Every structure is written in structure tokens, then in C-alpha cells.
Design a protein around this ligand. Structure first.
Ligand SMILES: Nc1nc2ncc(COP(=O)(O)O)nc2c(=O)[nH]1
Ligand SMILES: Nc1nc2ncc(COP(=O)(O)O)nc2c(=O)[nH]1
Lengths: 266, 266
């Protein structure tokens, strides 16, 4: 059903047997340091440890939510520690070219770019050079669509043409609808409801909805009260064919994914 | 989209605006009494109270999991108390004709028959007489299918012809795939995966998967560790068009339902 595996250095991720879980590494910095101090790096390692024990297949590590050089000095020790101590592929959640490059150098395995190569096109180049999967998220500086889904597909397509023109092999491309970016609450709902359309593009799809505003908007609930909303988006996502979910609650979300997988026959 | 409402005496349930939540009333009897003693009836009222506060639209009350007359003496006080104190329609989960009749008399609003009129055909008759919705679950005394879904649809059809021949109006008929009855673990999965087929029959569908074996079978987890599995089945159910879910965890399941509803545009 997917004629290839996701190549990630020492680890390989099958795309057919299960929905793969990307665990969001929570990266609480030291108000007292700029580097890789014991507390932040240790909390980070503990948290990746726990997400590994809970069912996570990938650990996702982000720098900013803010100069370039800071982002590295912050993010790089996190990667060296987690990669050394947790045997799962790490993805680096940055859009900056220099950041991606350091992170890979430091041991990151996948690039994760919330601007799908548009904020910093050199990033495709890095991806190309190190031969790593890169995630291209849908994003843009405006909410003005003539047709959300057709535009979303258009915009994503633009990211692929950037990735490809830079040397990126089809098999290293992953797409993501960027739910929660550049979309109104109702537009997010509509992307959800049409997610399967992304499949015509022929690439694996990652969905990132964990705890976002639009769940709050529907359910009327704070971020920490959004587990069941997230759950629904994960389920609907998997039914609609997505291959990855990006999630805070690895334990719960792993179980829902596993049950969906058995239902839909994945 | 449904050209009618569910008529239930003093209450009316719209079938278009949301997935309706049926809360499973947990009915822990007194090892010391046969009637309507303070503890069992009071725990029951408290539990229906809490499920009402959590988002339940219907309260479902069951007698046995066991003579006929016992079932009544047990179930009837439960209905009088809950109906008097909780303003939600109550359904009576029995297949026995005499039981259904007492329950309605006592104040039950919907019949809920895990043998869809086949164990006790007079039950359709009762339903007909009091003009109440009756749920017809798929069931049978064997697991031998030539084609699960086609047979399931066949068997269900047999229940409708019994309900109809007894006077039951189309608008009072609800169907249910009976996941967890007369099916192997893998067969349950396959019913799940083909639930939408039930819609060709033209009746509203209730799904009852809460905490059942097959979730345990997939996830490898005790009944009390089955919330996320249940969740997935609820989501997949709602996406596949079902109008009701029958669930233990009313709070969590209400939220998932609400989020699904907003996604699928219900
Ligand atoms: N690939 C991908 N990356 C992302 N990074 C950050 C956030 C938003 O930040 P948060 O998860 O920390 O709220 N969402 C995404 C997403 O949806 N997809
Ligand atoms: N309509 C309907 N009624 C039911 N009654 C009992 C049980 C199984 O008992 P439990 O819910 O107490 O485990 N399942 C159903 C069902 O799936 N649908």
C-alpha cells in the first residue's frame, strides 16, 4: 500500500502497519541559562523517555514557540541528549535552514517545517544534502481562500516544487494540512472534514491538531481540558488516511490510534 | 436530513443536530433485597443524575446481565425514581415482553431489545401499543456467516418485518449492529469497518461498543482500561453515520461526539 519505508538513518519507519505517533517534546528552558543546563536537558530526556514508553515512534523537538544562534544553543543539547538516550528517530521542528542543519548534525533525523520551505527555501537544500525526510506543513500569511481545500493543495504543491528543485526525493517528502495555521476556526473544521483530499498528492500525511484552539473553540475548553477533542481529530484523521499524528498525550493517543488501525484494517 | 424527530412522550430527540448519547445506567442490586430498596435505587438516581450533568440525552436501564417477575420488581422502582427525578427519556433494556410493558407503565420511554423482537415477538406488540421507539439489535445464536454484513442486514431486516407486522411505525424503529453479540473479535472489527452499510436500510442507527471484549482483544486491556478504545469506536461510528452511541463514560464520550459532530458537519 506504500511501496517504500521511511528511511531515517539507524531507524526505519514502516508506513503500512500502523499510524505512527509523533510525540511533542515539551522543551521548558532555563530562565537562567542559554545553553544545555542540567534541568532543561534532564526534563527533556525524562519526557522523551516517558513518551517512548507510552507508544511514541518519533520524538519532535522545537526551539521557539528568539534569534537564530539562540535557537541552536538551546535545541542542539536537547538533540544530543535525547538521541543518545532514547532510541527513536528525532525530528527537528524549525523552519530555519541553519537550525535544521545543526540539529541534523547534532543527531536529528527528520526536518519538520511549519512553512514547508517557503520561509527559508535553503532548508529544502539541507534536507536534500543529508537525505532526510522533511515535513512540509501548509501555511501562509493570510486567511483569504477562494476554495480552502483547493488552495491548501495548491499551496502544498508549491512546497513540493521547492523541495524537489532542491534535490529532495519523493520518498523523503511528508505533507501536513497545518490545522491551526492561517485558518479560521471554521476553516480548520473544514480542512479536517476534507483531509482525505490531501491523498491525491501521493505523499504521506502528518496531522497535528493536539490541543489546538479550534478544539477549544468547539468544546469551549482550556488547553489542558482538550484530550477528548484531540482524540476525535486523531480518529477522524486516521480514518481519512493520514500516516502520522503529532500529539502531546502519547499514551491516550497511541491507544486510539491502535484501535482505529484495527478497525480500518491498517 | 432526517425528516422527523424521535417522539418520546414528554421529550423529543432531534436526530439532525447531534449524535445523541445514551448513558448506561449501572444497576447494582442489593444482595439483601428483591425490590426497590434505598441503596440500589439511590445509587441509580445519583448515577443518572451524574450522567445527565455530563451530557447524556437518554438513560438506559437494564435488569439482568434471573426470572421474569424478579426482573420487574428490580427494574420498575429504578424507572419510577429516575424518571421522577431526572428529566431525560429512559429506555428499558430488556427483550421480554412483560418486562418492557411494566417498564413503560413505570415510565420508560424507549424499548431496547438485544434480540430485536426475535426472542419475544410479543415485544414489538407492546411497542406498537404504547407508540414508543424500539431499538432492534442485531443478534443470533451462532457465528456462522457467509457474508457478515449482508447477513447482519438480512437478520436486522427480519426484526423490522416483525416490528412492522405488529404495528410499529417506521419512525419508531431504531437499529443497532449489535457489536459484541454473536460475533468473533475479528467480526466485530469488520462490522465496525462496514457500519455505514447499515444506513441503506433507512433507519437511525445506535452503536453500543462501550468497554466490550473486542476493544480488550485489540488493545490488550482490562474493561476499566478501555476508555480510548471505546473512544475510537465512537468516533468511527459517528463518522459512519450512526445517530446514537451507548456508552459508560458519558463525560468523555460526549466531548468526542461533540467534536466529531463539528468536524463531520452534523
Ligand atoms: N508538522 C507540524 N508541526 C507543528 N509545529 C507546531 C505546531 C503548533 O504548536 P504546538 O503543537 O506546540 O501547539 N503545530 C504543528 C503541526 O500541526 N504540524
Ligand atoms: N442496544 C444495545 N443494548 C445493549 N445492551 C447490552 C449490551 C452489553 O452489555 P454492557 O453494555 O452492559 O456490557 N450491549 C448493548 C448494545 O450494544 N446495544
Amino acid at each position: 500500500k506504500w511501496d517504500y519505508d521511511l528511511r531515517c538513518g539507524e531507524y526505519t519507519l514502516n508506513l503500512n502497519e500502523k499510524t505512527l505517533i509523533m510525540g511533542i517534546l515539551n522543551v521548558t528552558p532555563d530562565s537562567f541559562s542559554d545553553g544545555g543546563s542540567y534541568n532543561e536537558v534532564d526534563a527533556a530526556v525524562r519526557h522523551a523517555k516517558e513518551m517512548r514508553d507510552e507508544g511514541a515512534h518519533i520524538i519532535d523537538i522545537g526551539g521557539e514557540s528568539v534569534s537564530v544562534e539562540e535557537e541552536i544553543k538551546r535545541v542542539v543539547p536537547m538533540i544530543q541528549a535525547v538521541s543518545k538516550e532514547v532510541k527513536l528517530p528525532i525530528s527537528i521542528d524549525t523552519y530555519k535552514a541553519e537550525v535544521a542543519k545543526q540539529a541534523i548534525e547534532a543527531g536529528a533525523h527528520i526536518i519538520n517545517d511549519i512553512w514547508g520551505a517557503k520561509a527559508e527555501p535553503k532548508i529544502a537544500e539541507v534536507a536534500a544534502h543529508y537525505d532526510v525526510p522533511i515535513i512540509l506543513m501548509h501555511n501562509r500569511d493570510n486567511m483569504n481562500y477562494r476554495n480552502l481545500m483547493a488552495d491548501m493543495i495548491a499551496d502544498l504543491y508549491d512546497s513540493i516544487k521547492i523541495a524537489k528543485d532542491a534535490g529532495v526525493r519523493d520518498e523523503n517528502i511528508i505533507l501536513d494540512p497545518g490545522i491551526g495555521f492561517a485558518k479560521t476556526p471554521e476553516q480548520n473544521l473544514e480542512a479536517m472534514r476534507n483531509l482525505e483530499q490531501l491523498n491525491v498528492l501521493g505523499y504521506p500525511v502528518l496531522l497535528g491538531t493536539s490541543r489546538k484552539s479550534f478544539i477549544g473553540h468547539v468544546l469551549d475548553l482550556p488547553v489542558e481540558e482538550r484530550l477528548e477533542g484531540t482524540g476525535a481529530t486523531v480518529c477522524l484523521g486516521i480514518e481519512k488516511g493520514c500516516e502520522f499524528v503529532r500529539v502531546h498525550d502519547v499514551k491516550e493517543m497511541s491507544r486510539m490510534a491502535k484501535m482505529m488501525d484495527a478497525m480500518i484494517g491498517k
